[PDB]
Every structure is written in structure tokens, then in C-alpha cells.
Amino acid sequence: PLPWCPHLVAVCPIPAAGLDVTQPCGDCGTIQENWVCLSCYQVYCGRYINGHMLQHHGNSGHPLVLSYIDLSAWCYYCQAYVHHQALLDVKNIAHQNKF
Numbered sequence: 798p799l800p801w802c803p804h805l806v807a808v809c810p811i812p813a814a815g816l817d818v819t820q821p822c823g824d825c826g827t828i829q830e831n832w833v834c835l836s837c838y839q840v841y842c843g844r845y846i847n848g849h850m851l852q853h854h855g856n857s858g859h860p861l862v863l864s865y866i867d868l869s870a871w872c873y874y875c876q877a878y879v880h881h882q883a884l885l886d887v888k889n890i891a892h893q894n895k896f
């Protein structure tokens with residue numbers, strides 16, 4: 798996984814309500830394999846369910862998303878996982894909610 802990407806600039810502040818790692822997909826309602834968008838904090842399902850986060854990427858252009866299953870961060874432009882100090886706050890808030 799990459800130690801930086803040129804899309805980390807689009808990672809936005811964490812809502813003061815925090816994150817709910819059990820939040821369902823905003824399109825289909827599935828509780829399985831959701832991701833949270835690190836720009837707008839909408840929650841959509843992964844590619845193996847109904848691909849709604851991929852659809853969100855395409856209709857918004859938002860680059861980076863966080864898995865509620867393992868707290869990895871994927872960039873859809875770089876087609877890679879990324880970790881950087883800029884992702885620790887959001888990973889830590891999700892880790893606290895999850896565990």
C-alpha cells in the first residue's frame with residue numbers, strides 16, 4: 798500500500814457526529830461490506846454487494862473511501878490502498894466505534 802497519494806487533499810474533516818461503522822448502504826440498505834466516503838461521509842456498499850460506492854465515486858469523483866470491515870482506505874483514481882498520517886484521525890474514530 799502506498800504511503801501517499803495525490804488525492805489525500807480531498808480528505809475532509811470528520812463530522813462531529815462521528816462515524817457509525819454499522820451504517821447501512823445509502824442506496825440499497827445492505828448492512829454488508831460498506832465503505833464511508835472520506836470527502837462527504839456518505840456510506841455505500843462495496844463491489845461484491847451492489848457496487849454503490851463505486852457508483853458514488855463515478856457520480857461525484859470523490860477519491861478515497863474507508864472500509865467498515867477492515868479500516869483500509871482505497872483510492873479509486875490510484876487504484877490502490879493508501880496509508881498516511883492524514884488518514885489516522887478518521888481510522889482511529891472508526892476503530893473506536895467498531896471495537
Ligand SMILES: O=C(O)CCc1ccc2ccccc2n1
Binds near residue numbers: 832842851862
Ligand atoms: O468499491 C469498493 O468495493 C471499494 C473500493 C475497492 C477496494 C479494494 C479494491 C481492490 C481491487 C479492485 C477494486 C477495489 N475497490
Ligand SMILES: [Zn+2]
Binds near residue numbers: 822823826827842846
Ligand atoms: Zn448498496
Ligand SMILES: [Zn+2]
Binds near residue numbers: 859
Ligand atoms: Zn463522497
Ligand SMILES: [Zn+2]
Binds near residue numbers: 805
Ligand atoms: Zn489517489
